[PDB]
RNA sequence: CGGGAAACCAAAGUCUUUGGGUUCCGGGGGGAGUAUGGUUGCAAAGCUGAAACUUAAAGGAAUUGACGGAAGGGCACCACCAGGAGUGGAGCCUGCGGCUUAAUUUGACUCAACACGGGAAACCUCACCCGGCCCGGACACGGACAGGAUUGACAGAUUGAUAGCUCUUUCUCGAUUCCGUGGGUGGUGGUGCAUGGCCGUUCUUAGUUGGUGGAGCGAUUUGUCUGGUUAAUUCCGAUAACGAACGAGACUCUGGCAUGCUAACUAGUUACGCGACCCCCGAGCGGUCGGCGUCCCCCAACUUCUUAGAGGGACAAGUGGCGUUCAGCCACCCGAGAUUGAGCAAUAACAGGUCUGUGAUGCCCUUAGAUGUCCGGGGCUGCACGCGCGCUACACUGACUGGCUCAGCGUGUGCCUACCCUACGCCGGCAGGCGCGGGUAACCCGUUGAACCCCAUUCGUGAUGGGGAUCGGGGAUUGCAAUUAUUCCCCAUGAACGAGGAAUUCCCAGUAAGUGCGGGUCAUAAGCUUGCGUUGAUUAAGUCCCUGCCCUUUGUACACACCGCCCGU
């Protein structure tokens, strides 16, 4: 069991959406405009070099 | 008569209902019959004789226990005698302390610990030491709850691991998350000296209480005994006790044997029909005979063996001795001659073990840098040592090799869960492997065709081939992982040990003792333990000599009770 005091952390990488962050662009009506790869089926988009869904976990490694 | 604390007393009586006359003398215990003073004494010493201080009890009689190197009866191989096999001595396997280590986790200490916690641990179990995840933190109190919290998932470094642990941030369950206060659920964390329950032991002997009655003021006592008798406070008796309950015994299971009974293709059948099949396989030309490793349907005969239901049977009954001639004992034809072995087990207890079996639990410890849980690798097994249960031998009644023939309890597959027992054919020396055909079982394993033992060869008193430790190389198995070698096989090294000091345990009949086989632990499996059967004695029919036990009589300055108390430089 763990008896030690030095851990030197443990907690969670919590997450927000109660930031100011835009996933398509502003402009016209009936015309959206995606800033990144994300998919009618949501949120696809490169994390730094590779790609993972939420809802589908498709995991794209070389385009 | 009557006194007295009572043991006792014709005085220790005539004592609160006290007064015959008179002498000496004591006021809690110790310091003390000490110091000093007086006095007698040849000397030893005698007579008279304080206080300071210290202490809560000293002290008498009876009552129950305990105890006796105290007597009287009696029983027990956790006792001895007569013996047998053993341990201690040597190799080793497991438990203990000490040493050691991050940790080598802990309980247990004469029987009543030390092969015990079914404690044979690779992981797991693991409670120990080194690291890493999680909150399975109920609910409510306030916030965060709309750019809306909070899930988590490979980026790449990192970590040990491809734990988005983190760093880093991108995705969602979205108000079930998330932060402080309140309550800790949780825990193989501490106290078995807070407990429950369950066990062990005192204690495997025969002992234990109360109702009414009698005695003592009383604690207590009698009933529970003078005596004989039995395994037994089991009887007959005796009797200021009577009538009853517990323990014993009685009861349950087990072994015996019942040529009688209801029965059996999942048993025997086995006797038979010889309904067939086979070998001249032999006296036998041959049949009848002997055999079958065989083959049958039930329209054979049943139940001796196989199984298990009711039965039945043994009860000091028959006879003879001994006895207060009651309880009973000894011997003998009969036959299971009352006799197999156990289970069960009272009164009062122990600061006997267990909080490490439990959602059984009080209190304390702790609960997020967890004493909760999960994962990784280790450790519980480490070596100058001493210990306690055990297997192996030390050999010729033996070992190596071949033939030979016989057993009984059980056990065995899909379960909240992962693998059972194994015939039979081939491959492989073997350890093993591959198709496979049975079993949830009187069905196939398995007519369980086990071992020492029975009959032959080799070895030749020699550390020899007895012995099988240690070490190297190899070959397979179960598993996420065999290295500090899980097991098993093969070659090979071939040590300690020449029957074991002081001590000490177990046993009296299919018991000791030898050999083998099941169950348990068990994915891998026993040198351990719980059971089964086979081979089969010598030495006893007794005593208290030792260690101990029950009852009675006596003794005590003991009462957490001789593991007691207690005396002086």
Known sequence: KSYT???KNKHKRKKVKLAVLKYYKVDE???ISRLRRECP?????SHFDRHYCGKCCLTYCFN
């Open 41 to 45: 089926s949501v949120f696809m988009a």
């Open 5 to 7: 005091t030095p851990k």
């Open 29 to 31: 009506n009936g015309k």
